[PDB]
Write a protein that binds this ligand. Sequence first.
Ligand SMILES: O=C(O)c1c[nH]c2ccccc12
Lengths: 269, 268
Amino acid sequence: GSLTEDGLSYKEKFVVRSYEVGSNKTATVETIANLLQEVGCNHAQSVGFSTDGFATTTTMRKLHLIWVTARMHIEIYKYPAWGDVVEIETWCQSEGRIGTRRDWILKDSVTGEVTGRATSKWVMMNQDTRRLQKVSDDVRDEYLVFCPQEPRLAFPEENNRSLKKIPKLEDPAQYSMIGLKPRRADLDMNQHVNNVTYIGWVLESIPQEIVDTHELQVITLDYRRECQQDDVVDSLTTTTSNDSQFLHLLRLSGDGQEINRGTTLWRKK
Amino acid sequence: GSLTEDGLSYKEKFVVRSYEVGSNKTATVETIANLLQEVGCNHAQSVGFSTDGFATTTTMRKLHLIWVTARMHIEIYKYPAWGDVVEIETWCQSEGRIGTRRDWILKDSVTGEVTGRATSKWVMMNQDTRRLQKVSDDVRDEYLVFCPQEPRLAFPEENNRSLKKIPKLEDPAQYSMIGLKPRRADLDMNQHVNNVTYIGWVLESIPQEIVDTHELQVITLDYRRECQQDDVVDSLTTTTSDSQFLHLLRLSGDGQEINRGTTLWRKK
Ligand SMILES: O=C(O)c1c[nH]c2ccccc12
């Protein structure tokens, strides 16, 4: 991988592996989400930021501050086949004191065609107290020099799906998958559950008949609270809709505390 | 990746990714096992065999025959760090009518040093009846031309750890992790549980204190029966000692054995 000529974005190529594909012999959305994370991490390393998933600056480390994902939105037009080369370009932009946004564009390396796009909202949090906070001026100037100054959006459209509010699923859910637990492979280097695991857990409550006859086109996921290594999760889904749409909710198995909410849009094969 | 000059082995380089490493910022044994599978798959493709993980020849496809793993043995001297380039060389050898063996050597790309080695035993099975069978002459000649004719072993040493018999853990287990279930990410393209998932399930019953103070050096795993997509597994472990453990994976309900294994851990 490498930073582009202007040094304001990063590009990297990946060859889709045998264990990364599903029943269609094309990459799963969890494989895509992992590659998005990998290219984000290589971009942060290329400009001197922390490499640990928190992308911290020198001032953030002293203050015990970290970047945490608040929302992930992914749209796939074509999933790359096993053996195909996919090129991913990523960039970061500040959204004032609210937080930062990381965007991605996925392309077929051979044709140069846009096969997918993604956007994510990140917020600053003290890693010990878990208290959210606005971005200060001192932290901001340290990373403004690595972001384009004019707006660059993966989802430029006026009322795009990436900014829609997600409602809370009401009991009873139409479908559910209960008692989901992370194993060591689901953890990152800091022993926290990897953000992509939650995508997998959301998708667990989609009936196999939908997965066999449809392809996932769009997924929007809000992250409200973290699943601890010793927590148990219930995944709930209700159909809201040729296209099929669903509302999703992940909550702790016991007390029903919300950890994530989301929506998915599926097109008939 | 590419077949080597003599066309009897295959080599491929991998850069260790951020999500592939554990608490030590080095690749997990599950990441290693996935890369071994990937290089095996690229070797089969390079010589015209099936894609799907079953590495079938033309005659096997007509007879509904597949290759299935019976045992996996991996020894790691150094886990590659995040961002490091690891080179993996793989080759196959027939073991008469018993089945086939696939071996691997892992190296640090910069130093050229051997950082790990692995071996696996594969048996032929009818995909529909799941009945094991010896390898016929007709199936054999089709793949003998892709194997070295003189023996080439990743574990040459006499009485090496890759061929030791594994006993059955007796109840009560010292440690356990119950109710383990696969999710869609644990499945391969054929909707079968990926062989590497069983390694993760075995390791789930190792106490976190061992994982924090030791590094996994050797793992030997026997595959007896497959976990279906709707099955539930219990992972059992007992200390037999460096620290050594005996492992057992069995179905949560009736206690049917799916795997047995052993692990050897070195103090950090
Ligand atoms: O798939 C098989 O049966 C194979 C036996 N020897 C090999 C060498 C390379 C790739 C696949 C095989």
